[PDB]
Structure formats: C-alpha cells, structure tokens
C-alpha cells in the first residue's frame, strides 16, 4: 500500500537505514557482531556515496541524516546494544568515559518498513 509510506518518499532515510541492515547482516554472516563502529559507519558510508555525491548539499544532507540516525538509534530508537553500563553512562556516579564508548552494536530488528 502506497499510504504505508517508507518505501521511496524518504530516500535519505531508506538510503541510510539500508547501510545499517546491509552492513550488519554482512558482518553477522561473516562473524556475528563486529560492533565498535560509530565514526567508521559514517566514514565508509561517505566514501561509498562520495562518488555519487556531486553536490556538497547532498553530502551535508547525507552526513546529517546518518549522524542523526545513529544518534537516534542510540537514544530515541533505543535499538542499540551495549555490554557494560557503568562505562557508558555519564552522570550519577560521575563516570570518566573520556576515551570513547566501550561496546556499541545495533539490533537488526529496528522499526523501519522498506
């Protein structure tokens, strides 16, 4: 059904979300769960689409969406998975966490349609 949406209307969303499911299913097929890919996920993404991105606007938009999605994924969507808690949860005890996030992995479930 066309009214269902989330098929072509949101090209940026579909283009970004596909990166998550495709890259995850690929690595789980190889190993199981690579994890640890905050900047890496965006990094390879940009390097893959940079050839089709002939306009600065596109890149800025793609990076905005990819970043927003990851940020949402780790919060609003809450489809992210982490091993520990005390090493990734700021405030309360006043954890350091100045280096980087311990373990970061995403659930292949999500809430997209496509």
């Amino acid at each position: 059904a066309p009214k269902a949406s989330l098929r072509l209307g949101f090209s940026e969303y579909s283009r970004i979300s596909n990166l998550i499911v495709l890259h995850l299913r690929k690595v789980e097929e190889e190993e199981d769960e690579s994890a640890l890919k905050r900047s890496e996920l965006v990094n390879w993404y940009l390097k893959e689409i940079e050839s089709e991105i002939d306009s600065e606007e596109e890149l800025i938009n793609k990076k905005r969406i990819i970043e927003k999605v990851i940020h949402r994924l780790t919060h609003y969507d809450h489809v992210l998975i982490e091993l520990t808690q005390a090493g990734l949860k700021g405030s309360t005890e006043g954890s350091e966490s100045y280096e980087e996030d311990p373990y970061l992995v995403v659930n292949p479930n999500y809430l997209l349609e496509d």
């Binding site: 965006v42 940079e50 600065e56 890149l59 800025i60 990076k63």
Partner: peptide, 29 residues
C-alpha cells in the same frame, strides 16, 4: 552553503571534497 554544520568532524572532510570536485571536472561529458 549550509547553516549549522552537523558534526564538524565528519563534515570537515567536505572542505577537501569541495576542492576535489573543483579541480577535477565531474561534469558528465
């Protein structure tokens, strides 16, 4: 070209990208 560059760290790569498509003609022949 854009207001409030989201994630300057990831977007900084664009400052060099703009130069790339500047010296190299990407215009479809």
């Amino acid at each position: 070209s854009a207001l409030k560059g989201v994630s300057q760290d990831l977007l900084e790569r664009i400052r060099a990208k703009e130069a790339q498509k500047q010296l190299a003609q990407m215009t479809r022949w």
